Design a protein around this motif. Structure first.
Motif, short mmCIF file in Angstrom:
data_model
loop_
_atom_site.label_atom_id
_atom_site.label_comp_id
_atom_site.label_asym_id
_atom_site.label_seq_id
_atom_site.Cartn_x
_atom_site.Cartn_y
_atom_site.Cartn_z
N UNK A 1 1.15 -1.09 0.06
CA UNK A 1 -0.06 0.55 -0.70
C UNK A 1 0.71 1.27 0.19
N UNK A 2 0.67 2.27 -0.71
CA UNK A 2 1.44 3.40 -1.42
C UNK A 2 0.40 4.51 -2.23
N UNK A 3 1.43 5.46 -1.56
CA UNK A 3 0.28 6.44 -1.98
C UNK A 3 1.38 8.24 -2.17
N UNK A 4 1.02 8.61 -3.02
CA UNK A 4 1.53 10.49 -3.16
C UNK A 4 0.68 10.74 -1.89
N UNK A 5 1.28 12.20 -1.78
CA UNK A 5 0.40 13.53 -1.01
C UNK A 5 1.49 14.93 -1.05
N UNK A 6 1.33 16.30 -1.83
CA UNK A 6 1.87 17.31 -0.87
C UNK A 6 2.39 17.70 0.03
N UNK A 7 3.73 18.52 -0.29
CA UNK A 7 4.31 18.58 0.93
C UNK A 7 3.87 19.48 1.04
N UNK A 8 3.70 19.83 2.81
CA UNK A 8 2.80 21.65 2.96
C UNK A 8 2.11 22.04 3.68
N UNK A 9 1.33 22.60 3.00
CA UNK A 9 -0.21 23.06 3.59
C UNK A 9 -0.29 24.33 2.66
#
Ligand SMILES: [Zn+2]
Length: 46
Positions: free
Chosen positions: A2-10
């Motif tokens: 199980x893997x997934x990308x995500x933005x860095x920061x907010x």
């Protein structure tokens, strides 16, 4: 597995159609365009 990308920061703005955030709101609305423009009918062949 199980893997997934995500933005860095907010960011205060985010696209709830694909998953693209933008520090500014002017960079988001101009992006959502890709999610609005086509037609469910299209070039009808009569
Ligand atoms: Zn998007």
């Amino acid at each position: 597995g199980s893997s997934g990308s995500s933005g860095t920061g907010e960011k205060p703005f985010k696209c709830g159609e694909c998953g693209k955030s933008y520090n500014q709101r002017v960079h988001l609305t101009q992006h959502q365009r890709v999610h609005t423009g086509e037609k469910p009918s299209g070039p009808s062949s009569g």
